[PDB]
Design a protein around this ligand. Structure first.
Ligand SMILES: [Cl-]
Ligand SMILES: [Cl-]
Ligand SMILES: [Cl-]
Ligand SMILES: [Cl-]
Ligand SMILES: [Mn+2]
Ligand SMILES: [Mn+2]
Ligand SMILES: [Mn+2]
Ligand SMILES: [Mn+2]
Lengths: 252, 249, 252, 249
């Protein structure tokens, strides 16, 4: 019904506009609070030391000079007289798979969605390489997810990290629940030289042994399956608390 | 043992130097690979699109023009002929508690430590005369304790140290992550130009008993074992049924 | 005839697209090489230490992961088999007046245009404050400037810093040649406090005595005149070389 | 005299400390207002949208969380009860020659010095053991020479120092700005992933006699008097006729 929409690529990004329109046409009351620019490369932390400017484009659309987390946080703490029951973050220009999820700005917005007691979904479009972006397919996926969460909503302890293959909806195989992978386990750092002659290092590409087998988000988007990874909102490993306590007591 | 040391505040930070010296004096073979500048404010992602420069300062001291994750990753993938069994990240100038942990650059380095199959520890000094020696003294005991009984290779330790002397610590407390910005109401002021600016509200929240907030508040060195895999495996069972019912229509 | 177009706000900016279309419809062969994101806040220097990625959107449009100067420089040094006789930089989302010109990324692209021996124009849209951007007016101004430079081109020693009032073309008074101003001469630093209690400083607003009188770019855009400031491409003050030399000899 | 000192490399930079000490020992009342971090890579514009924090380190030493222009601007508009007659910016870790001057953060601080009605000097050390003492020794002579015969209040001095000892300098040379990237052809290589990346070509250009490039090349401390007003007043005469002919149709 009521959806708060944000992203990483900025408010002028085509990914979020198509998503907002798709949700508008789906009968959902949208609410866009997005960064002023593509802040992919800056921290995702809440801006606490400095105040944040929030210019409004039009109704239901606010531009925010700050991190995606700042967007969502402000949007739910006084910036808006709006009470959404779900936060949809996206649609990101690229994909968010494996280790790229923890530091993802798109995911960080959704991460801020749960911290304030709201179900959240991070939607990304796995694009590589001439071609045309399929944000409509990713949006069409989103409008079905939000609708399915209306009937029987998933537990208030996780968010959905959704990644969409950059293709058409007919070519799309379907949906699969996947776990996060690990692309750069055996990434062998290559050493080349700049024109100046100094030594520069490249982070190695996907090695022979990489965590991208079946059941991982990498595999799903590889075989044209819209990946859905339920990820933690609490980094605390509660199943390790029992062991570390004994370890700490022997150290205390 | 062999210890790889990194941070967030940069290689010229006093937090990492005191830590490296403390580990040196503790009989551990240290190895410092740290950012060139304080990159608190930039992304923590691995730099893939551009190559990374790595200037060496001295014996086992490397300045890296890139993220803390780039430091650790390179240091274990060819930059060094060094095989450490533990990665100690710190000591950060500030603290890393609750929601500030997921986006922490200090923690991100340690996070990169486990991804390559190495136990990792993020050490921070909760400051608001920085007592880095106390945080370092805590670290040298943790790494030593991991020699006998090492961590299970599935989690890293997020350690935060109260900015005081060692004679004021009442011990260590295993805690979880808190959430101070639960329902923190934002405030609205104006700039000298009059344009409307928004402040993120100050500290209803999660900072009670068992939290790392309450830990470092009572002068206890907080130790939070955190996930290295964001995947909520205990939710995979339910989402699958939810997804199958969605696939139908 | 042949125009190279760049900006500061990124390749996905509406300012550059409308400009490119206006130049396309004007019978000019356009060529867009723009940053991948809004790099307003990063340095304008040429990226020398690291290599630059240049993804192509479509023909005549290349996205560049680097500074506006990197865009123009590469576009004229091998990235393209294209030989434009003019470099139009814009249209920037904001204005570039007075001291904001030296550090302007939009102007920096045009600045790179002259360094390689090409006439260059920086076009900006003075926007303040609900409202609708008038990029079309700024573009309509640009297509007349480029056309006028076809007949009798301005000398190859300067570039044009053009700023357009955010209004319609009919409301527009006309064009005026102006000099750069100085908004923050007597800007009195105000001192307030953050919620935490620490002391923060605000850079003072336009004081009573500010260089924005008649003949300055500020005044033109104030009275709905499209400002045109011919600015230096060589920072060297050649009229001071005669004095400093005597001063240096007395020091040598 | 009263000297306001700033830089680009940050307040913890060795370049500015040696400069400040040299000016202190020269009998000048110094005043250091420098960025908190090395902001080479960020914009030089005045921070207007957000407020600026200014932590004080010691007596006449202020760390500013903002651009070099923010440092100088604040330092002359209320942050300090200090009225210097000259602003010395440096000493930058690298050199500032030709087209690298307009976007230089070191120069931007000095540029902010003139905008508020104060003579300003940008001092850089052309490095490719950093000889900051030589660059500082050059600076203390320049500021002293400006006491007797001050600069005309319309330009600032862009000073660049060869990274050598003082016993190797053949003197000072007043030069102009060069242009090494005139027609430098870019090169095309590939990343390990195979995707096409572009390198900006190395040094037909402008670095001959009279240029600051050729100056610091022959171990001469280059002094380039640069504009503070980008307006080309000698072009105002022609553009006006060009604009009037454009206004007609
Ligand atoms: Cl992202
Ligand atoms: Cl941190
Ligand atoms: Cl700009
Ligand atoms: Cl510089
Ligand atoms: Mn993004
Ligand atoms: Mn830090
Ligand atoms: Mn811009
Ligand atoms: Mn510098």
């Amino acid at each position: 019904m009521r959806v708060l929409v944000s992203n990483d690529d900025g408010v002028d990004a085509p990914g979020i506009k198509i998503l907002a329109d798709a949700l508008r046409n789906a009968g959902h009351e949208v609410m866009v609070v997005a960064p002023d620019r593509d802040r992919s490369g800056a921290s995702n932390s809440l801006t606490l030391d400095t105040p944040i400017r929030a210019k409004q484009i039009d109704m239901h659309t606010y531009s925010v000079a700050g991190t995606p987390t700042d967007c969502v946080h402000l949007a739910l703490t006084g910036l808006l007289n709006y009470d959404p029951d779900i936060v949809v973050s996206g649609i990101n220009n690229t994909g968010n798979l494996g280790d790229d999820v923890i530091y993802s700005g798109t995911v960080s917005a959704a991460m801020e969605g749960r911290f304030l007691g709201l179900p959240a979904v991070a939607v990304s479009l796995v694009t590589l390489y001439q071609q045309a972006p399929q944000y409509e397919t990713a949006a069409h996926a989103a409008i079905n997810i939000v609708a399915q969460l209306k009937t029987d909503p998933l537990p208030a302890d996780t968010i959905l990290n959704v990644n969409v293959p950059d293709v058409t909806w007919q070519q799309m195989r379907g949906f699969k629940v996947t776990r996060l992978g690990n692309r750069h386990r055996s990434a062998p750092c290559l050493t080349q030289t700049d024109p100046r002659g100094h030594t520069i290092y490249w982070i190695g590409p996907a090695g022979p042994e990489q965590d991208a087998g079946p059941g991982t988000d990498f595999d799903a988007v590889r075989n044209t399956y819209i990946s859905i990874t339920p990820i933690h909102v609490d980094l605390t490993r509660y199943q390790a608390l029992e062991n570390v306590t004994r370890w700490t007591d022997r150290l205390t």
